[PDB]
Ligand binder design. Structure first.
Ligand SMILES: [Mg+2]
Length: 318
């Protein structure tokens, strides 16, 4: 039951990029409230959850609730050095989708993760021995320069690949398509494998896991891909909704199909691209188009749900 004190006011220490107003709105307490250790735990927990801080302290000072913080440094610049097989822009992109980019905060605890995530990104191009080293340099105004040093290592060529879980198609049939029109890279093989099934009605197809064993000289790899085929599915309908910018009728006309035709992953992509192209011809250069299947295992059918948001109509007068 305890009691706790009544907050007469709140003092902050450490705020820099975080507005005091935004710091207060993110806190579960304000002046006038009676705060106890439980509330202080909530406040500390809440401030940390913003992701803005590297450390939060909250303690009573007479009638004042004192909030002391250590904001994450701001990433002023990211430099990739030593890479060549994979270019700067691609590495920049890979980090951006991973919560890391110039102008944002660097969570100093996640560093090892950034290094490992990049070394792994390298698996996408046949290099399983890459090593990445993050060099963080402290700047003024709590800023930081992030430099990543790469030793890409040797590329590995597929020595052998096995498929486990394929009954509908023979392993040789499937592998026969990994030889383009060593040959193709693993990443390409998986992409080809998936499409093979998705283009033939296997709406449930899934690559469950991929085991890759690197040879002692690290120049070859042995692959085992474990898949779940599932059954073939009939497409029973295509539903499109969202913000169609007054073109539902034309887009609706692009969802035309043969009721009950086989599900086909590629036709779906084509449909979407066709919708994008249609909206482009009206001033919309960046429309959001996503598709989610509604699978009915009962009678092996699929309803395709397409969401569309036309976006910003960009007018440019010369
Ligand atoms: Mg470079």
């Amino acid at each position: 039951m305890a009691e706790g004190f009544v907050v007469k006011d709140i003092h902050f220490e450490g705020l820099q990029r975080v507005a005091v107003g935004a710091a207060l709105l993110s806190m579960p307490v304000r002046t006038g409230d009676t705060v106890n250790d439980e509330d202080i735990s909530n406040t500390i927990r809440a401030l940390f959850a913003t992701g803005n801080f590297e450390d939060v302290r909250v303690l009573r000072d007479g009638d004042t609730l004192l909030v002391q913080v250590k904001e994450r440094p701001t990433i002023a610049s990211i430099t990739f050095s030593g890479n060549k097989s994979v270019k700067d822009d691609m590495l920049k992109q890979n980090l951006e989708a991973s919560g890391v980019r110039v102008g944002e905060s660097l969570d100093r605890t996640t560093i090892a993760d950034i290094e490992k995530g990049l070394e792994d990104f390298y698996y996408s191009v046949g290099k399983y021995s890459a090593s990445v080293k993050a060099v963080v340099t402290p700047l003024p105004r709590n800023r930081v320069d992030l430099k990543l040093v790469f030793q890409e290592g040797v590329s590995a060529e597929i020595q052998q690949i096995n498929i486990v879980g394929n009954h509908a198609f023979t392993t040789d049939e499937l592998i026969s398509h990994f030889q383009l029109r060593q040959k193709q890279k693993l990443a390409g093989d998986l992409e080809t494998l998936r499409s093979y099934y998705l283009d033939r009605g296997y709406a449930r197809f899934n690559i469950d896991s991929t085991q890759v064993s690197l040879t002692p000289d690290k120049k070859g790899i042995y692959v085992t891909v474990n898949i779940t085929e599932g059954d073939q599915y009939k497409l029973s309908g295509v539903e499109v909704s969202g913000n169609l910018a007054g073109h539902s009728a034309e887009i609706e006309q692009l969802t035309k199909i043969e009721p009950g035709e086989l599900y086909n992953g590629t036709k779906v992509t084509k449909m979407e691209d066709d919708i994008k192209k249609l909206l482009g011809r009206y001033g919309y250069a960046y429309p959001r188009v996503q598709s989610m299947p509604e699978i009915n295992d009962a009678d092996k059918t699929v309803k395709l749900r397409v969401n569309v948001d036309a976006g910003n109509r960009f007018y440019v007068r010369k």
